[PDB]
RNA sequence: UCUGGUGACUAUAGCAAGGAGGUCACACCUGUUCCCAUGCCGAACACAGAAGUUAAGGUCUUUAGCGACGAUGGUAGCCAACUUACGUUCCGCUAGAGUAGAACGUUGCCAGGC
RNA sequence: CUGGGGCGGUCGCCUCCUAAAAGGUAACGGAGGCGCUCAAAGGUUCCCUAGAAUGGUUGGAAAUCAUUCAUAGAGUGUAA
RNA sequence: UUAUUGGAGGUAGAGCACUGUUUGGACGAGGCCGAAUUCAGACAAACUCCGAAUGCCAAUUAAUU
């Protein structure tokens, strides 16, 4: 129940995302109770390996920058071709 | 010996708006040509026999909303 | 032998073949299914030909689902006559399939048995397919 | 179990339909009349701006008097007539709200007609 | 459906032509039109 | 009586609507007027054009777009009609049932299965005409209506 | 000040529930002599009453169960380029619809008695 | 006129799709109409507002209905 | 020709709220089984609760021409 994210910079061009999705990163967003709209990015293998313990629904400890919040999987855009995630949604469980 | 029976068609009636929004027009100028009440008449705007919107006072055109899902065109005397 | 009971117009305009599948890209009835990876026109003759070859090797030991139905009929002028004389008569019914669209769906059978049955029905289809299973992550 | 229908509801609807091609405008203001099951109220309103400049009711202290339940209307009409006579007593559009023109309203309508109200 | 010519009594001019159904109204049509020369709503009669 | 919180929540009898069924005047030139007078012989009112010949709502044989007669009786005439319905209308019936749904003509589904004008005995009638009388009440419930159907008059 | 009367704003203003009234005023109810009415019934409309009643409409409370309003973040398409040709590819531009989170039980104008 | 000519079929006007969110736009491209009717289907004033399922014509499972939904689902002299 | 702002309109997409088409569940309707309302999921040149990019009309001051 742990994950380290990285605050993404503002205004990302298509090429940027493509290059970011070409490696082992997947753009995500965080929003909910006692928090504002913050855009971050996590690892694909690190997310799938930490989503088999709690399963579909389960409280996780995301390291948004220099803080830890309890969030869950609200939505996730999946690509049928080449079975790869493209976007993840985190909602504050608090 | 194949035959046909679909080579008939009527003429096209130039419909649509005739005056732009914020343009100066003179009384009697046509503002819209439609088949029904696509746009209702506003202030200083009458409806013709063929549902044609025309101005009665010389001023600027103004396309606004009337209700929540109906449009309307009006004209103001202010130059 | 799959065709609509009745249609408003007997002459269409040939469905466009571009972009990716609009919907139906996940198996929701069976456990395994055949996913397309190329774009092409699927006629009713081929659809029923692949279904007969799948049930024949399954020996009525499971349920089969068809997520495609010929909705657009296409015409064809016979005995190659001179061009310009109007549209021809209906020849058959087709169905456009884009990459990421599930074709068939099997259930209530061995996982290795469904992998062989789907492979036999893929030889009667004019599109590259791929064996997939119910996803859940 | 047949249910009853509101009388003010239907009336309001009808009134709105009659207010689609009739409105006051300074020179020609509209004389709205509200008839209840006890008294009747009337006031000259200017739709152009949206402000009243007259008031007359049957529940007024200088109108309240055990009448024949129809004479009050006549007085009401004559009451606002003099009030309207002070300032703006020329061409005016009479509004019958949503009720019929025959009845107490008629008496109130003709009350100003004989008072001098050019309408 | 045939043509109808409303004749005048003073005018003497056919400045009013209308239509009607003989099978429907076989009787003569009598309406009150307006003859400019007389300048008065007179009672016209179909010939 | 049954825990009414006020003296205005007690149910009432809304209206009483009844008249002849088809009385098809397409082949019955004077039977229309005869049935009209028969309806006028129970309560004196002119007969209009509507389907007021049912025991409740509509749930019988279909056709639609007909041309029958109807009568509206809701005041002290309705009370007198109920009195005559307990006198002449229980001379031949003598069978109190119980229901609160539909019958002849959410209704609109039938116009058949009615009575045969029993109080109109062949003492001044030329035929028998279905004149089922629909019951209109301020009943908020069909079983409360059944409680009123046995209340103050034949079950 | 209060409830009313008449307006302006896109239902954030709707429907549903669960409540409390109130009798200033509304309503409800009582009639059919009176003007006036049903394609007939005084149901409605109209006039006269107005004894009783808040039961219903109803005004004020509570609830987001509906309905409507919907941040962001992504991408579908597309404009202009470049490449090989285009069931494209890549680089810039504008960035949807679906959906998440959420907001919503309306704000205003004028006249009177109060 | 014409994917050579002949044979056949068409030749004027009205509505939609093709038509690429202004208007306009072709083919022997795909669908339908008109060659009128109406003395009230006109003018003005006033007032009104389908389908489901239960007292059963052994039942066409829609008589001319009671009042729920109507929420306009209709209706408009005529094709869209 | 740009910049700035205002407006008219239903295409590409997407969607099933209407019209038609469709698949599995589900429909009863007769002394024995057959005309169905919901649940989920699809399709549309002559379907639309929605809806871009471009182009088009205009207005204003600026800036080049």
The domains located in chain A, with CATH, are 4-92 (2.40.240.10)
| F3 in contact with chain D, both atoms CB, cutoff 8 A | no
B72/B61 Cα distance (integer angstroms): 11
Contact of F27 with chain D, judged by CB distance below 8 Å, is answered with: no
Buried-state track A55-85, b at ≥16 Cβ within 10 A, e below 16 = eeeeebebebeeeebebbbeebeeebeeeeb
Are F74 and D2 contacting, i.e. CB atoms less than 8 angstroms apart? no
Question: For residues D45 and D30, is the Cβ–Cβ distance under 8 A?
Answer: yes
Yes or no: is domain D21-110 CATH 3.30.420.100? yes
- Which helix (H) or strand (E) is D40 found in, with range? strand D40-46
C37 contact residues in A (CB cutoff 8 A): 81
Q: Is C86 on the interface with B (CB under 8 A)?
A: yes
Q: Is residue C2 part of a domain?
A: no
Instruction: Residue C100: give the domain boundaries.
Output: 23-137
Helix (H, G, I), strand (E, B) or coil at C91: strand
Interchain CB contact of C85 with B (< 8 Å): yes
What are the backbone dihedrals phi and psi of residue E2, each rounded to the nearest 5 degrees, phi first?
A: -125, 175
Which bases of chain I are contacted by protein, using any atom under 7 A from a CB? 6-9, 13-15, 20-24, 40-47, 50, 57-59
Q: Check CB contact under 8 Å for A81 and C136.
A: no
* Protein-contacted positions of strand H (CB under 7 Å): 2-4, 7-18, 22-25, 27-33, 36-39, 46-48, 51-57, 59-69
Q: Is residue C4 part of a domain?
A: no
Q: How far apart are CA C91 and CA C72, in angstroms?
A: 11
Q: After which residues is chain F broken (C to N over 2.5 A)?
A: 105
Both tokens assigned to A7: 């605050």
- Tell me whether residue C11 is in a domain: no
Go through chain E and tell me how many residues it has. 47
Q: Return d(Cα A66, Cα A5) in angstroms, integer.
A: 10
- Give the Cα separation of F93 and F116 in Å (integer): 11
CA–CA dist E35, E41 (Å, integer): 7
Per 3-state DSSP, chain B is made up of helix, strand and coil in percentages (nearest 5) of 0, 40, 60
Strand ranges inside chain B, DSSP E: 16-17, 24-25, 30-33, 39-41, 45-47, 52-55, 59-65, 71-76
The secondary structure element, H or E, covering residue D7 is helix D7-18
Read off the tokens for A80. 């049928």
Domain membership of residue C14 (yes or no) is no
Q: Tell me the backbone φ, ψ of residue F14, rounded to 5 degrees.
A: -45, -75
Contact D77, D92 (CB under 8 A): no
Nearest one of A14, A15, A71 to A42, comparing CA atoms: A71
E-D interface (Cβ pairs under 8 Å ≥ 3): no
What is the distance in angstroms between the CA of the first residue and the CA of the last residue of chain B? 68
Pair A35, A71: CB distance under 8 Å: no
Q: In a 10 Å sphere around its CB, with 0-12 CB exposed, 13-18 middle and 19+ buried, how is residue C22 labelled? A: exposed
User: What is the CA D16 to C1' G63 distance in angstroms?
Assistant: 34
In angstroms, this model's resolution equals: 2.9
Compute the distance between CA of residue F45 and CA of residue F71 in angstroms, rounded to an integer: 7
Q: Report the distance from CA of residue A81 to the C1' of nucleotide I16 in Å, as an integer.
A: 26
Residue C72: helix, strand or coil by DSSP? strand
Residue among F80, F67, F22, F73 at smallest CA distance from F46: F73
Residue of C nearest to A54 (CA): C137
- Closest nucleotide to A13 by C1' from CA: G92
Domain ranges of chain D: 21-110
Residues 6+ apart with CB under 8 A from B31: B17, B18, B19, B25, B45, B53, B54, B55, B61, B73
Bridging pattern class, strands C96-97 and B59-65: unpaired
Confirm if F43 and F81 have CB atoms less than 8 A apart: yes
Tell me whether D1 touches chain F (CB under 8 Å): yes
Query: How many distinct structural domains can be found in chain C?
Result: 1
Which residues of C fall within a CB distance of 8 Å from A26?
Answer: none
Compute chain E's Rg from CA coordinates.
11
Query: What is the C-alpha radius of gyration for chain F, rounded to an integer number of angstroms?
Result: 16
Contacts of C37 (CB under 8 A, 6+ apart): A81, C99, C127, C128, C129, C130
Cα F94 to Cα A8, C38, D81, F88, F154, distances in angstroms: 89, 81, 70, 11, 9
Q: How far apart are CA F83 and CA F89, in angstroms?
A: 9
- Count of domains observed in chain F: 1
Name the 3-class secondary structure at D47.
Answer: coil
Q: Which residue has the tokens 């045969």?
A: F116
Residue F125: give the domain boundaries.
Answer: 1-155
3-state SS assignment for residue E3: strand
Q: Number of C-alpha atoms within 13 angstroms, CB side, residue A61?
A: 5
Q: Would the CA dihedral through B1, B5, B6, B12 be positive or negative?
A: positive
Other C-beta atoms lying within 10 Å of the C-beta of residue C73: 18
Q: Could you write out the three-class secondary structure of chain A? A: CCEECCCCCCCCCHHHHHHHHHCCEEEEEEEECCEEEEEEEEEHHHHHCCCCCCCCCCCEEEECCCCCEEEEEEEEEEECCCCEEEEEEEEECC
Beta strands (DSSP E) in chain C are 32-36, 40-41, 63-66, 72-75, 90-94, 96-97, 102-107, 129-133
SS3 content of chain C, % helix, strand, coil (to 5): 20, 25, 55
């Amino acid at each position: 129940a742990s994950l380290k994210s990285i605050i993404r910079q503002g205004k990302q061009t298509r090429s940027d995302l493509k290059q970011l999705r070409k490696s082992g990163k997947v753009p995500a967003v965080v929003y909910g109770y006692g928090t504002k709209n913050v855009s971050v990015k996590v690892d694909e293998v690190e997310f799938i390996k930490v989503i088999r313990e709690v399963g579909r629904n389960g409280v996780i400890e995301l390291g948004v920058g220099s803080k830890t919040i309890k969030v869950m999987v609200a939505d996730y855009q999946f690509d049928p071709l080449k079975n790869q995630i493209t976007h993840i949604d985190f909602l504050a469980i608090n | 010996v194949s035959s046909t029976k679909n080579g008939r068609d009527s003429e096209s009636k130039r419909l649509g708006a005739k005056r732009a929004d914020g343009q100066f027009v003179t009384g009697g100028s046509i503002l819209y040509r439609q088949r029904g009440t696509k746009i209702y008449p506003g202030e200083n705007v009458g409806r013709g026999g063929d549902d044609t919107l025309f101005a009665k006072i010389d001023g600027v055109v103004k396309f606004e909303r009337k209700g929540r899902d109906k449009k309307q065109v009006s004209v103001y005397a202010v130059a | 032998m799959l065709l609509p009971k009745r249609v408003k117009y007997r002459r269409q305009h040939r469905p466009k073949t571009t972009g990716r599948s609009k919907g139906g890209n996940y198996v929701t009835f069976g456990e395994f299914g055949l996913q397309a990876t190329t774009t092409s026109w699927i006629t009713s003759r081929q659809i029923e030909s692949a279904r007969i070859a799948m049930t024949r090797y399954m020996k009525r030991g499971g349920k089969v689902w068809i997520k495609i139905f010929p909705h657009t009929p296409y015409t064809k002028k016979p005995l190659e006559v001179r061009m310009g004389a109007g549209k021809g008569a209906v020849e058959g019914w087709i169905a456009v399939v884009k990459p990421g669209r599930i074709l068939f769906e099997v259930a209530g059978v061995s996982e290795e048995v469904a992998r062989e049955a789907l492979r036999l029905a893929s030889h009667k289809l004019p599109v590259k397919t791929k064996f997939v299973k119910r996803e859940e992550l | 179990m047949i249910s009853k229908i509101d009388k003010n509801k239907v009336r309001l609807k009808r009134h709105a339909r009659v207010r689609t091609n009739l409105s006051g405008t300074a020179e020609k203001p509209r004389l709205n009349v509200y008839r209840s099951n006890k008294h009747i109220y009337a006031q000259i309103i200017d739709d152009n701006k949206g402000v009243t400049l007259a008031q007359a009711s049957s529940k007024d202290s200088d109108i309240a008097t055990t009448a024949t339940k129809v004479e009050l209307a006549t007085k009401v009409g004559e009451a606002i007539a003099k009030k309207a006579a002070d300032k703006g007593i020329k061409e005016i559009v009479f509004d019958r709200g949503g009720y019929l023109y025959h009845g107490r309203v008629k008496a109130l309508a003709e009350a100003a007609r004989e008072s001098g109200l050019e309408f | 459906r045939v043509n109808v010519t409303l004749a005048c009594t003073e005018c003497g001019d056919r400045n009013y032509i209308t239509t009607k159904n003989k099978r429907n109204n076989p009787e003569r049509i009598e309406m009150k039109k307006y003859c400019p020369r007389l300048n008065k709503y007179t009672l016209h009669r179909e010939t | 009586k049954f825990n009414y919180s006020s003296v205005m929540e007690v149910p009432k009898i809304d209206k009483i609507v009844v008249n002849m069924g088809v009385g098809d005047a397409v082949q019955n030139s004077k039977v229309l007027d005869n049935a009209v007078e028969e309806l006028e012989l129970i309560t004196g009112q002119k007969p209009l054009v509507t389907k007021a010949k049912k025991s409740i709502a509509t749930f019988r044989l279909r056709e639609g777009m007909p041309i029958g007669a109807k009568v509206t009786l809701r005041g002290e005439r309705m009370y007198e009609f109920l009195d005559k319905l307990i006198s002449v209308s229980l001379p031949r019936v003598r069978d109190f049932q119980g229901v609160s749904k539909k019958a002849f003509d959410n209704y609109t589904l039938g116009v058949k299965e009615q009575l045969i004008f029993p109080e109109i005995d062949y003492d001044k009638v030329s035929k028998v005409r279905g004149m089922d009388i629909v019951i209109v009440t301020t009943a908020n419930t069909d079983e409360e209506a059944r409680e009123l159907l046995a209340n103050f008059g034949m079950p």
